[PDB]
Symmetry: D2
Subunit: 261 residues, 4 copies
């Protein structure tokens, strides 16, 4: 199996994209750390992964306590003696306050900007020395299709994720000599709790209509890209901006009227 003997860390992995990513890595033989705030929920995912024949473990991560970005990484390295894979999946925004430039909350914009960007910067920074020691690694950053598709709202989300794509590419260039790769996966609309709970039915219905492949995404879709980038199957690939959004915003905005679902 592809990741036999490798150690991976996935943040925010007790549900949705994070959990699917952890499951996919564990199926291919990685020892997967669920870096998550809830040990009780993590233990359920772990038992489920073990049932499928894989090994996963828990390490505490809370985005509200930024120190845990580094401590999570150091705990894993101490316990396993190596770190091979890091998947940075934490991210979000405040739909109540993250609007357009003028209507959005100024302070919250900069809170969101730092919160998302640091969720890549801090753990990547801590993990790199351990990855260097074992002769390489892969860092996979979950961005969003909004990072390359300017919008009319959620400006802090869009800009901060675009910043993550940039940071991905700079990290990739800076540690290529150490065989450390860095790539970004940009999901579109995926049928997780986050989208279903924060975006109204009419928003998601409108959005779906502009998705050429004509369905809502699954967490597995994202996980499968994460697996590609995590493994040596993408060993010659670094700095990629990888779109997993059913072709959303690929072409003309006339698409939905001329190709109606």
């Amino acid at each position: 199996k592809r990741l036999e003997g490798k150690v991976a860390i996935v943040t925010s992995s007790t549900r949705g994209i994070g959990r699917a990513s952890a499951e996919a890595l564990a199926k291919e033989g990685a020892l997967v750390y669920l870096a998550a705030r809830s040990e009780e929920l993590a233990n359920e995912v772990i038992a489920d992964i073990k049932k499928q024949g894989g090994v996963a473990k828990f390490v505490y991560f809370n985005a509200r306590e930024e120190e845990t970005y580094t401590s999570m990484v150091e705990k894993v390295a101490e316990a396993e003696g190596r770190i091979d894979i890091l998947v940075n999946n934490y991210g979000g925004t405040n739909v109540n306050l993250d609007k357009n430039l003028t209507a959005g909350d100024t302070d919250e914009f900069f809170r969101i900007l730092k919160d998302n960007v640091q969720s890549v910067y801090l753990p990547a920074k801590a993990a790199i020395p351990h990855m260097e020691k074992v002769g390489g690694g892969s860092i996979v950053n979950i961005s969003t299709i909004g990072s390359v598709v300017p919008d009319i709202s959620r400006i802090a989300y869009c800009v901060s994720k675009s910043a993550i794509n940039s940071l991905t590419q700079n990290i990739a260039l800076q540690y290529a000599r150490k065989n450390i790769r860095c790539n970004a996966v940009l999901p579109g609309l995926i049928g997780t709790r986050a989208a279903l709970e924060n975006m109204t039915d009419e928003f998601r219905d409108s959005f779906l209509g502009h998705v050429p492949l004509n369905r809502v995404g699954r967490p597995e879709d994202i996980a499968n890209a994460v697996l590609y980038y995590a493994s040596d199957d993408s060993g010659y690939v670094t700095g990629m901006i990888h779109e997993v959004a059913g072709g959303f915003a690929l072409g003309t905005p006339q698409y939905s009227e001329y190709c109606p679902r």
Copy 2:
């Protein structure tokens, strides 16, 4: 496994990237047609794929006989009743005549332009209806990193492969409703006959100095991307321009100077 029950076609697949891609697909259970100009050589590859537990077959294709792009597709569709996957791998240039704008041959430029672009247009056009009939398909076009990195020579190669990238995305948009996906894989310097026999040691040594991940690629690196795009593992991904070039041209041209290999 991931491609059990599927029928694939790979053009120019008796060696190098084409062969490796055919091998990777067959290993995952696809029935792979080697669309190639030499039946004798195809029979060798077929015998080896069979040794490995896979099934491959031969269909006649020569880029010099443009009719064969369509006939090979019709032959496969008739023989197997379906086509699921098309990998368009044929491509190239004339190093004697394809130079910069002014020094390169005018007529050859346009010959190359049509030669490369039709190698995607013609077989994709014939394949589509067969793909529609089985509820979808995947078309993977082998471009080159040169398609997004302007150069000081091989202008026809660069321009024609850029055209392919555009063609890839238009096809992707146009057949997404039929669950037909189209993605491009752009190799950098790969250790095949084409690069090793047409480019000098000194050119390839220079090129390698600017490759962040600091090695020549393998046909397997490309085949691994083809596999991703050919399978349902990339079912929500279409219109991608996928760079497999070791990070070549990702960032500053000062790179080799400050990070000397």
Copy 3:
């Protein structure tokens, strides 16, 4: 007068963008050759330009007679002793035969591909040695927003214009040392004969709904960019892909729905 003493050639310049580009360059003191197929119409424009206080001349050009791309450049250099500016404005498609991949006419796809691409390659190739001689020049290629926005019809147009974008950037890299710059201007919907007579009222109204700046473009909008790139105001600018389409396809395809006109 920014262009005093300079010699410019604008193809297909008896109406629309070509004309407006010729007029703008002439107003800034350039001697402007109308490379056109109708001498009679060209003489009307020259007259109008003369009344405005500028100088323009005629040189025969017809895209159906490809030798004229070269002959018209040599005539101009012979008559004036120099060439400074080249605006490649010719281009188009056949709306009856240029559809999607499968419904479009195969042979006409490759005719349009050559026709459009050669409308840049041939005259630029001819002009470069003359620009070299006077210590530099500017080549401005008229592309289209369609070159960076995949569509569901006019596939030959989209791909061929994308090819021109790549050709532009390769030329730019290749002749920078000679101070010969090359940039591309990409118009959106412009109120000229070509759009009004070839596209339906329904199509053009739909398109306009997706233009954030909420008006149809004018030939003058494109001429103004052409002037920028033609002069030393852009002396440190080469290889640009310059969008003049009122924001069309800048951002989310939900735009029209939430921000309707």
Copy 4:
């Protein structure tokens, strides 16, 4: 009649370099230019010089370290002149001692730089927009850097933050197009100003120059000329552009300096 007769512009950090050159170009075309600057003494010298060149400029206090001045400087201009038409956001920088790669760079300073640079667009754009809406439109021109689209091996906070400004530019562009407010980014390469000359070594600057195809160091006027285009109605149908002014730096293959010394 001058192009910007009766318009009011604001240029931040405009007592020298790019900012001064931009102010000068706008004033030369008839705009009333406010120098939003930290030193009234120096601003008065620039004002006197602009006056001699035949233009009109004024002072308004702005210091990046006093973030409330982003807003008060805007309000002051609107109160004094009853309108705002043009905003040029030119303040930006980094700390070369602390802004290194991911691992060697200072964590806290990375996020300080990120907020400093991004807020230098966010805050004053947000304050100016309502005034621009009131006069029927406006143009916001953000001074980025070529580094925003060219990943590097140092100055990661500078690269990432400026990339974020590009994204912010495009979201602003989309969001206020319906108010005829345009937003575009100009990306300077190596310009002969105090900041590049004092903070970068001769060795770095010389190496950089070897990779500039147009083969000279840029001038402040080159940036100013682009600013003038975007600020004026000559670009009235242009919004969301990322405009490169770097003599072709990083346009193409990193082998360029080798083969085109």
